[PDB]
From Swiss-Prot, chains A, B:
Homodimer, a subset forms homotetramer of two homodimers linked non covalently. Interacts with M, S and E proteins. Also interacts with the accessory protein 7a. Interacts with host VPS39, sequestering it on late endosomes. Interacts with host HMGB1; the interaction enhances the association between HMGB1 and host BECN1, promoting reticulophagy. Interacts with HMOX1; the interaction promotes ORF3A-induced autophagy but is unlikely to be involved in ORF3A-mediated induction of reticulophagy. It comes from Severe acute respiratory syndrome coronavirus 2. Residues 106-192 form the CoV 3a-like viroporin CD domain. This is ORF3a protein. The keyword Repeat does not apply. GO terms for molecular function: identical protein binding; molecular function activator activity; monoatomic ion channel activity. It is found in: Virion; Host cell membrane; Host endoplasmic reticulum membrane; Secreted. Plays a role in viral egress via lysosomal trafficking. Forms homotetrameric ion channels (viroporins) localized at endosomes and lysosomes, that may induce deacidification of lysosomes, allowing safe egress of virions via lysosomal trafficking. Also blocks autolysosome formation by binding and sequestering the host component VPS39 for homotypic fusion and protein sorting (HOPS) on late endosomes. This prevents fusion of autophagosomes with lysosomes, disrupting autophagy and facilitating virus egress. Residues 55-62 are extracellular. The lineage of its organism: Viruses, Riboviria, Orthornavirae, Pisuviricota, Pisoniviricetes. Changing S132L: In strain: Beta/B.1.351. The second or the third transmembrane region are responsible for Golgi localization. Changing P3L: In strain: Iota/B.1.526.
């Protein structure tokens, strides 16, 4: 017969890992990588505990209201599986590892000789302001920051799952125009022609 | 005696709600509100299923390696509980409902006569560029967007749990300077004096 106690220890281990995932502070790079690993462990434990309960009900007699309920579990996990492999396809698309870490909607990216940059972004917004600080030089858009290696390009691309939009550097803002020393603003406009 | 089957149906209902929370697209306001509600349901089901398992082990004899495991579950849930009431304190602090919805690190906010604005933000960054579009007028910082009611202020505040930082509008950028029509850039510098 199938034993009962393995389901109980799986629930307790799932509770430990879920309550630990919910209080990660998500501030630095290693904290984001740690929380993504703990999220993967949580979904593995949830998948294990639900197939274990379905096997128990197979041995005891599984009802039809429970048939479509466990069917709902497996269907939503299949949709989640195709989302993860699309995230890996997006990770290949931008050629940087930030699609697995940062969990945003869109990603702004341009290619250099030392780095293939990518910075998180929330929507298509018709104008993007990249602010590079003086000296550490680092490009930031809305708080998310990536360190400077090579230099700026004219056309940057906003990537997502199924879309891609291009922006051209229309004009740049020095410190003479604004008065804010030690920064420089690059202003991009969306090209549709 | 305590029945075994309620733990199984609680596990199955937790699986449905967890697999449904993981594939919300998080693009509009009602989708963010829906996913936060489903997250609350998930933690209620997890709390219920772990105290049910602890009660069954109390009836059967609970081992000391399992004593500290369920102690770990309850301790991490206490840390999660004080985090939620701090999110509500932050929701009272900037006087808008976006701390419950958007799940970012810092929030930029200024008060008007028709609206108390608040826009998500990731870190303290020494310069903030708020871009208001022409006509719908809407203030956006990095993709997150809020509709325009009254007008702009000189001093905006970046709020968090324990911190608060102020930024002054150093100079503004029209369409004459950049060439990007139908937008206007407000450039803020951090005040330390």
């Amino acid at each position: 017969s199938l034993p009962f106690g393995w389901l109980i220890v799986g629930v307790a281990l799932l509770a430990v890992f879920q309550s630990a995932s919910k209080i990660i502070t998500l501030k630095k790079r290693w904290q984001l990588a740690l929380s993504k690993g703990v999220h993967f462990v949580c979904n593995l434990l949830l998948l294990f505990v639900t197939v274990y309960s379905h096997l128990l009900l197979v041995a005891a007699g599984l009802e039809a209201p429970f048939l479509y309920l466990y069917a709902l579990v497996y269907f939503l996990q299949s949709i989640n599986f195709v989302r993860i492999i699309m995230r890996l396809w997006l990770c290949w698309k931008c050629r940087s590892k930030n699609p697995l870490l940062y969990d945003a909607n869109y990603f702004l990216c341009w290619h250099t000789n030392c780095y293939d940059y990518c910075i998180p972004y929330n929507s298509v917004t018709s104008s993007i302001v990249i602010t590079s600080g003086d000296g550490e030089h680092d490009y930031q858009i809305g708080g998310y920051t990536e360190k400077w290696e090579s230099g700026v390009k004219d056309c940057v691309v906003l990537h997502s799952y199924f879309t891609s939009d291009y922006y051209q550097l229309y004009s740049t803002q020095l410190s003479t125009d604004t008065g804010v020393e030690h920064v420089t603003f690059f202003i991009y406009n969306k090209i549709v022609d």
